[PDB]
Write a protein that binds this ligand. Structure first.
Ligand SMILES: O=S(=O)([C@@H]1C[C@@H]2O[C@H]1C(c1ccc(O)cc1)=C2c1ccc(O)cc1)N(CC(F)(F)F)c1ccccc1
Ligand SMILES: O=S(=O)([C@@H]1C[C@@H]2O[C@H]1C(c1ccc(O)cc1)=C2c1ccc(O)cc1)N(CC(F)(F)F)c1ccccc1
Lengths: 9, 224, 233, 10
């Protein structure tokens, strides 16, 4: 999930 | 750790400082409007707002204390609600209109199954106006949506303690504005009940959808 | 002017308690199929609706509304009201949903239909939440009336909001009486009202499933249920 | 009209 990456710096 | 040690004033400061910017749309007021273009413009906007929303969420007290799996779930559950309450807030001083962006101010007419949701958003904006919702209350309400919306679908306890702190903050804000105790509790209830229309609007929105960026599709996924 | 406003807190509580509908029984069984499942629930819900309407007319303030506004509120709120009722009487049966005294179900049964399990689990979490909060009957009837008045009022005036205010006052009065501090009072008030957002969500998801069930002919649904349903399309 | 109307008046 892109959301999951964006949540990581 | 530190979310439960903040004074109410510190909580308000934290939330206000975390506020995302108001983004512009690509509306070109010459272009004839398609149905496809209007949705294109809104999708483009929402997608960019999502990036700021994700980074705003990290700054909501308590949110980074949650596992990453839980952060994802909360944002998946709440993102449309959060976009919607932002829209309603910045639309407050524009009766009968929705300020999607400073350069994109639409009325019901330009809606149209979107008209139905637009009407509800307008009504919600009308309600905040009548109640004279304050910025400090707004940022509390928006943080509540984030924490609340997915919470029912051992670490649940941390979220509820942070929710309690935001309630204390709303109450603090109202006592400072000179409201009697009775008035504080009444206004508190009034604001929270709105969150339930807002949940309603978000769900009806998803339903009516059934032209989308990769991020939107990944989050639009979590409601089916 | 409305008589509802002039009621004291105890009078409001006593009125709401006295207005409570009865706990109905289903047909008299298991195991279950999708048709027989929906058959019992549809039959039961239909009879519950007749009592709900007579209950709603006894909620202080409701009689003062026009017929059209009464219709609108009940159309918007009815599944929410059935659900909060279900959750309330399921409290004492952790892990179960007490649809009727003779129809107590768990998740396994929820497989029975399509989408029932997800709603099932949401209903169970709500019930558990009510149990862990030790929700009192007096609080429950306040919450249920709030749902009736609130749920449709943004889709229409000030009368409804003054009555809602009166019920807020009444919830606080109940909590003060139970010994809660000022902070505990506001906190609990918020907690209860936020759960209403989740009840709205369950109803929304529930309602679109009842729509699809109309849109097979899985089961016969009454004219009454159809027109309650159609108000949400 | 609707059953609901009948039921609310009666
Ligand atoms: O809820 S909707 O109206 C939704 C709400 C409002 O208008 C629609 C919309 C929107 C959002 C995303 C998008 O890709 C398109 C449209 C809105 C919006 C609100 C605040 C913002 O800051 C930005 C955008 N919707 C569902 C959604 F959002 F998922 F697209 C929808 C779509 C098509 C038809 C009917 C409803
Ligand atoms: O929407 S669902 O959750 C919904 C909720 C629950 O089950 C469905 C349902 C219901 C309601 C009406 C109906 O014609 C059929 C089913 C329920 C119900 C709840 C409380 C009652 O007192 C009676 C019935 N579902 C199953 C599909």
């Amino acid at each position: 999930k892109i959301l999951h990456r964006l949540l990581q710096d | 750790s530190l979310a439960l040690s903040l004074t109410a004033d510190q909580m308000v400061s934290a939330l206000l400082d975390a506020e995302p910017p108001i983004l512009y749309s690509e509306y070109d007021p010459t272009r004839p409007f398609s149905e496809a273009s209007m949705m294109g413009l809104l999708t483009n906007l929402a997608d960019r707002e999502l990036v700021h929303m994700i980074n705003w969420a990290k700054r909501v007290p308590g949110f980074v204390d949650l596992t990453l799996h839980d952060q994802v779930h909360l944002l998946e559950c709440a993102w449309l609600e959060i976009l919607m309450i932002g829209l309603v807030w910045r639309s407050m001083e524009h009766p009968g209109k929705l300020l999607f962006a400073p350069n994109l101010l639409l009325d019901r007419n330009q809606g149209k199954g979107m008209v139905e949701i637009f009407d509800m958003l307008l009504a919600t904006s009308s309600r905040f106006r009548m109640m004279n919702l304050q910025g400090e209350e707004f940022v509390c309400l928006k943080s509540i949506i984030l924490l609340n919306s997915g919470v029912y679908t051992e670490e649940k306890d941390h979220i509820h303690r942070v929710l309690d702190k935001i309630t204390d903050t709303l109450i603090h804000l109202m006592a400072k504005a000179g409201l009697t105790l009775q008035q504080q509790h009444q206004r508190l209830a009034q604001l929270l009940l709105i969150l339930s229309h807002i949940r309603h609007m978000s769900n009806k929105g998803m339903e009516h959808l059934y032209p989308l960026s990769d991020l939107l599709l990944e989050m639009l996924d979590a409601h089916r």
